[PDB]
Amino acid sequence: LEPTDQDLDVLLKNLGNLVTPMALRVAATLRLVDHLLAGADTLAGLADRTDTHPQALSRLVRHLTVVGVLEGGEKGRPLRPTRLGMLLADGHPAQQRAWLDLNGAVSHADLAFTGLLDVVRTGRPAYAGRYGRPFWEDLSADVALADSFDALMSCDEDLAYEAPADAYDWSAVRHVLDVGGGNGGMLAAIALRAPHLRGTLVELAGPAERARRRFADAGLADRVTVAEGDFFKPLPVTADVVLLSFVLLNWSDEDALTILRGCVRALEPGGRLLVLDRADRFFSTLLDLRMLTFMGGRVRTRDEVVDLAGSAGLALASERTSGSTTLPFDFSILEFTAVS
Ligand SMILES: Nc1ncnc2c1ncn2[C@@H]1O[C@H](C[C@@H](N)CC[C@H](N)C(=O)O)[C@@H](O)[C@H]1O
């Protein structure tokens, strides 16, 4: 085993290359590709429509040219995107211009990776060290960050919760406590399936406001209420159902437990807690480190949740996973009761 010359090329140009991904983000953020397709082609022209330094922009563009994002501007051809560079046009269905946009939650959070040494040393996320507050607290205070994070998640689409709402039986359920319920998708899909069931949703100010709007829109304001609150604090009410929909994954093993201990605390006896959650190899570890770095969470396998649950006074009553046509992953509902 002796590293070849091609091996070094791959480390410098890709695996260890921090300069290029940052160049790609600045290019998407200044809407460079869009500005080129709309008739901009001179360099001085492009710098004007981006409020950038002409010379510094020239140098970013030289590097983007070299990596095959742009082409032209010989020095006397017209500047334009490559086949590859059309991925950064606003309308392209893969939405990479938005994924890379530094005004957006994910790229903003991607910057926190400069503190990855400490994330590995302590196992704590780096987001707070960079921006002053933890991921979800920052999103809640900043509507631009919240809406751009949601725009990129498939749980945001109009019928993302239909399949998992069909999975379970809400005809006997009286009251759902939706802990960190976001902007209300699951609970609205439940309330609609079960006309007599009451809802209570607990969220930070940001999603709280948005969920009130969803519940008014759907005609559920009368029986579904929204409550600002910290789910690390004792929960506002009790219920015969307590739902954690895509919450546990946002948190370490330890924080997941203290959230769960708060939920068991709010669970009315005889009641159930449900946990809705859940090339090839690469995209899953990429998402794994993003989860770790942004908010100290992780995707837990079925067994790994059962033991955090059991470690807080909960026994598995049942499970079910299943495909959804609108979801690009399989969802999982874990039903728990109190052992005690
Ligand atoms: N300390 C906290 N207290 C209460 N809610 C929080 C806290 N930290 C994060 N959250 C919220 O929990 C949510 C987690 C999200 N993955 C949304 C889950 C949502 N239940 C869904 O159906 O997708 C965010 O919307 C946050 O606003």
Strand order, beta sheet including 224-228: 224-228, 198-203, 175-179, 239-245, 267-277, 331-338, 314-322
Q: How far is the CA of 160 from the centre of ligand 1 (A)?
A: 17
| DSSP helix/strand/coil, 264 | helix
Q: Do 80 and 70 touch, CB atoms closer than 8 A?
A: yes
Q: Where in the chain is the domain with CATH 3.40.50.150?
A: 154-278+297-340
Report the structure determination method: X-ray
C-alpha to C-alpha distance for 33 and 81, rounded to whole angstroms:
6
* 103-152+279-296 carries CATH number 1.10.760.10: no
Task: Give the residue, by CA position, lying nearest to ligand 1 atom 20.
Answer: 181
Fold of 154-278+297-340: Rossmann fold (3.40.50)
Q: How far is the CA of 246 from the centre of ligand 1 (A)?
A: 8
User: At how many Å resolution was this determined?
Assistant: 2.7
Q: Where in the chain is the domain with CATH 1.10.287.1350?
A: 103-152+279-296
Residue with tokens 């437990």: 257
Contacts of 312 (CB under 8 A, 6+ apart): 257, 260, 261, 264
Residues with CB under 6 A from ligand 1: 136, 140, 155, 180-182, 185-186, 203-204, 207, 230-232, 245-247, 250
Q: Is 166 annotated as a binding residue?
A: no
Task: Give the residue, by CA position, lying nearest to ligand 1 atom 8.
Answer: 136
Task: Give the residue, by CA position, lying nearest to ligand 1 atom 2.
Answer: 230
Element (H, E) at 242: strand 239-245
Kindly report each contact of residues 102-106 with a partner whose C-beta sits within 8 Å and lies 24 or more positions away, as own/partner: 102/25, 102/26, 102/28, 102/29, 103/29, 103/144, 103/148, 104/145, 104/148, 104/149, 104/152, 105/139, 105/145, 105/146, 105/148, 105/149, 105/152, 106/148, 106/149, 106/152, 106/290
Q: How far is the CA of 182 from the centre of ligand 1 (A)?
A: 5
C-alpha distances in angstroms, 262 versus 236, 259, 275, 335? 10, 5, 14, 16
Rounded to 5°, angle at Cα 241 from 274 and 313: 65
Write down the architecture of domain 1-102 according to CATH. Orthogonal Bundle (1.10)
Q: Where in the chain is the domain with CATH 1.10.10.10?
A: 1-102
